[PDB]
Amino acid sequence: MNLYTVIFINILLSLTLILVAFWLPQMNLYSEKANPYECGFDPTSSARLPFSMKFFLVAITFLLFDLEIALLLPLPWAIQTIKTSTMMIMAFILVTILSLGLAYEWTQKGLEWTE
Amino acid sequence: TYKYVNKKEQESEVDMKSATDNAARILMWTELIRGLGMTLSYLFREPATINYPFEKGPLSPRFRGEHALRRYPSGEERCIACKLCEAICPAQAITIEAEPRADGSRRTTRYDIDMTKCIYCGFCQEACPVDAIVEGPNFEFSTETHEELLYNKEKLLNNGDKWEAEIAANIQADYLYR
Amino acid sequence: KRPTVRPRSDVTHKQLSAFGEYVAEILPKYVQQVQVSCLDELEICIHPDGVIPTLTFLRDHTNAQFKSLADLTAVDVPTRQNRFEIVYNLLSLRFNSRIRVKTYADELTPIDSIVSVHIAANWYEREVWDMFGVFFFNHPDLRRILTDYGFEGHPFRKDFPLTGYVELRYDDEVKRVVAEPVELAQEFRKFDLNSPWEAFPAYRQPPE
Amino acid sequence: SKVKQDMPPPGGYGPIDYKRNLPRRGLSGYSMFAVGIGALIFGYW
Amino acid sequence: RSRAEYVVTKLDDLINWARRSSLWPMTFGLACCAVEMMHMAAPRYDMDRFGVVFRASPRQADVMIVAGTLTNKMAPALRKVYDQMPEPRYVVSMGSCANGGGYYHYSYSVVRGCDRIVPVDIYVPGCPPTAEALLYGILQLQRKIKREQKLKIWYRR
Amino acid sequence: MFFINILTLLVPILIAMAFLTLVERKILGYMQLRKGPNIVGPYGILQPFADAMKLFMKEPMRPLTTSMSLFIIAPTLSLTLALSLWVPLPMPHPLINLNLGILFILATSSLSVYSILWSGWASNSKYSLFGALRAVAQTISYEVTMAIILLSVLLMNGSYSLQTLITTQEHMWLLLPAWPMAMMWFISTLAETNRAPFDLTEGESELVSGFNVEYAAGPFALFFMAEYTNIILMNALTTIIFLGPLYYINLPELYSTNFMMEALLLSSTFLWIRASYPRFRYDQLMHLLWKNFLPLTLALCMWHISLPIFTAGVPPYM
């Protein structure tokens, strides 16, 4: 209840700040005021156009690695087990497999950016 | 003659001590630490900031500031309407009109300097044969309208009357060089 | 000896005269004049058809090796039929020398671009076209480089006025920066700063 | 009178350093690796 | 006078104090005058000590220091970045070029003063004006916007 | 009384953020042979209030191409997540005592990254798009490396709570056993907080202003407050995790004082680093965090799996 209360207090504080920031100062807006910024000239094309991504393979690898992190995260409770040999072997296997995948991608130039 | 800024001479070979030194340099960020130390030394130094407007940066008597029209010690205007300053002004910032005065003296009826057009080069004060037009050391004369920087003869004579105690001293300190 | 006169070395003049004879006899098809100034500078005035062969020969000849184009410019002399004199200053680092190659053009006869010889000629010829209107054949992208977009006229010409024909101001009715016919609060005062007495008898032209 | 001009002193000016001068500081790699490993071992114990 | 008039005057003083103690110029310059502007940014004069800090985007800028020759090709861009600044904005022309054209007044490609394009609050003369003179212009602008009476005029409406 | 506790946490954190802005100006000035603000107020201490008032009395921007909903949503989201990340820290007693404190920290940090991304996409500008994509790459690299670092450290600690970290460092700092991953965690906090050399989203010289290039006045103030509150936050988290302040049951004021001194030292180190170093290129940041930090982090994670097993120093569950 207390955490929910303080989250709501933060929400109310930030909403109050942005509300007073939008309703306190004098408004004077026209077309050139609200045109988008392109260092003084008109934009040649819209910014909603496709914008090429040179680290897409690294992003997919980040998805897989983040799930490897999710697998590795119950370790502070796993170290309390009776059969610590099995836990230690399984954790070693998991981290070694993750490292081998990273090494294979590094060898196959997947970490390098395209073009 | 010439020298190499990045070419390395021969090789240092490979050694365990050198390899360990390079490993420690890579791992422990030694050049980054000494850059931090340089910034720390600058932090503990004394800043070079003066307390403007209560302290002003140093200048010289040669300094070219706001224009002024001077006088003889009798009070007669030094300017004789010869238009040498107007002729030599590289920006054509000086406009001069003249006629004989009531006593027959050769004096200006219009001496305008467009300080928005002037380039503050001192050619007028070094072409004046009688030291009439000068660049006195005033530089804090910024205005709020464009018109106030369009000086006429009354403004320039008032500047000469205001700054004569300093302009005369600067010309006294400077005139043997020029 | 004399402290106010520039010292003069004749060895540079002799070397430049010999090299001018060399280039003139190598390329008699295009070379129209070869001169060496008293400032020890070599100028070779060529036909406009020989710009590409002359520049290529000067860049790639073993005895020339003028591999660096110092600059490319134009001079508007509007009293001859071909008013634009195109000037190429070139530098030979191998022989530590400089040469000047001149040719001519008018408003309606373009000359060949030398972008295939020197890559700096791209922007230099763009500047020449923008400022004088001398078109260049086979340029990769010829357009204006220094004037405003939509600027009419070539302002480095002699007959173009100093202040131009239009001036910009912000109009609040249209909320834009607009172009108007030029009006000056103070006209540029032209001066007649020419002495009526001859200064240099060595350059006295014969009477007409 | 005597010609007075902005001139160097008759004995000349002093030497002005211009070369690159880095201090060449820091301790050896073996010593700092030993310090780090010792800190690791003490912390582990 | 009325008690509410005094409160309005004090609120005007507070607003003007905030706006003059926090003046962020656009990171915008054109020439030698902008070189003197970064010599004002330099440790001797310390615009940051005065509270004056450059911001690159015009949206975070409060003042625009036109430091250099405003050409015809540059004038739409200058007007654009001025218009993209938010409303409490000021203009400091710097140098003879931005004031009235200067050494290029009679040129075909030079706007004869940036006041033909943007409304200039303060003109700083020189070619270049020293960093002392530009700092003087900044302090004069601070005094000018200290003199503003917006809430008092609104109350008297 | 709990609302009074909320106030006495939130308001001093905001004032410490504003004076962090002032102290950044002063420290950067004195490292740059100048003084920094000393006119506005006695020693410049009214300068942050002047800046805040100016920004909140300047009009905001609402561009025509801009998605208004996300444009409004992003800065308030950023400030709320900054204060939410501040809420569970123990000094030595947290306002909100959690079991999975560092998991809460990680989730809230990733949501702050989303605030940056939505600001950059909503402000329909190319520089904002550049800032958003650079934020994506940056958070990829530091997210994977920082997650493995924190996993190894808490494997040494034994639980996800932070009072447990206080009890762990009752006798000795974790800097001595875990100083390489302390260095990597410090670099990860720099990249998380978007501080130089890893800022790359408010790129001053490369971009114009990056993700907040279309933001003005109030929302820009919200973004700046969120960022500097995150700076103090991550340095406070670093000194709680690695440089354990002296904790005594009879008096917690000594812990609060030691925590304050170490957090101030780490924040000043952040300002020192910003003064000292030039900015990374954002592909080089990813290459660094994926080629140097990540293999060593995996090796040290395996080492900290093994270490309590062969030393019998398995930490307690509670």
Ligand SMILES: COC1=C(OC)C(=O)C(C/C=C(\C)CC/C=C(\C)CC/C=C(\C)CC/C=C(/C)CC/C=C(/C)CC/C=C(\C)CC/C=C(\C)CC/C=C(\C)CC/C=C(/C)CCC=C(C)C)=C(C)C1=O
């Ligand atoms: C030679 O050729 C040329 C160039 O080539 C070299 C050129 O370049 C060129 C162009 C030249 C220029 C444009 C000149 C520009 C000058 C420079 C590039 C040099 C200047 C140097 C810099 C800009 C580097 C500056 C470095 C620094 C470290 C300074 C620090 C700056 C920062 C931006 C960071 C600090 C942040 C701020 C100042 C703002 C921070 C404060 C806030 C946003 C406030 C937020 C706080 C709150 C909202 C808190 C509120 C909450 C509360 C609780 C408060 C309580 C309130 C109450 C009222 C009670 C030209 C023309 C040129 O010819």
Ligand SMILES: CCCCCCCCCCCCCCCCCC(=O)OC[C@H](COP(=O)([O-])OCC[N+](C)(C)C)OC(=O)CCCCCCCCCCCCCCCCC
């Ligand atoms: C919070 C606690 C304090 C933390 C430190 C805070 C003070 C110091 C801050 C310094 C300023 C940092 C600013 C940002 C710098 C960004 C650049 C950077 O750091 O790059 C990382 C650099 C990268 O180096 P690089 O990029 O130059 O290297 C080139 C690499 N290639 C060619 C692949 C590109 O260094 C590292 O990645 C090293 C990380 C730390 C490693 C620590 C290892 C310690 C020893 C382990 C055990 C060894 C023995 C094993 C057992 C043997 C048994 C026989």
Ligand SMILES: CCCCCCCCCCCCCCCCCC(=O)OC[C@H](COP(=O)(O)OCCN)OC(=O)CCCCCCCCCCCCCCCCC
């Ligand atoms: C602008 C819109 C913003 C929208 C996003 C808001 C983000 C908020 C800040 C980030 C939150 C990240 C996720 C946190 C989830 C809860 C974390 C957690 O571990 O909570 C557990 C904790 C107690 O559990 P435990 O630690 O096990 O303790 C048991 C014994 N003491 O505590 C609990 O069990 C309490 C359970 C509730 C905690 C979350 C409360 C959220 C309140 C709603 C926020 C949004 C409201 C809707 C939008 C309003 C209008 C904009």
Ligand code: SF4
């Ligand atoms: S200083 Fe130069 S530009 Fe200015 S009025 Fe004198 S001659 Fe003209």
Ligand code: SF4
């Ligand atoms: S040069 Fe001197 S005397 Fe001649 S017109 Fe100018 S100010 Fe007068």
Ligand code: SF4
């Ligand atoms: S007024 Fe002078 S110094 Fe300033 S931009 Fe013009 S030419 Fe340069």
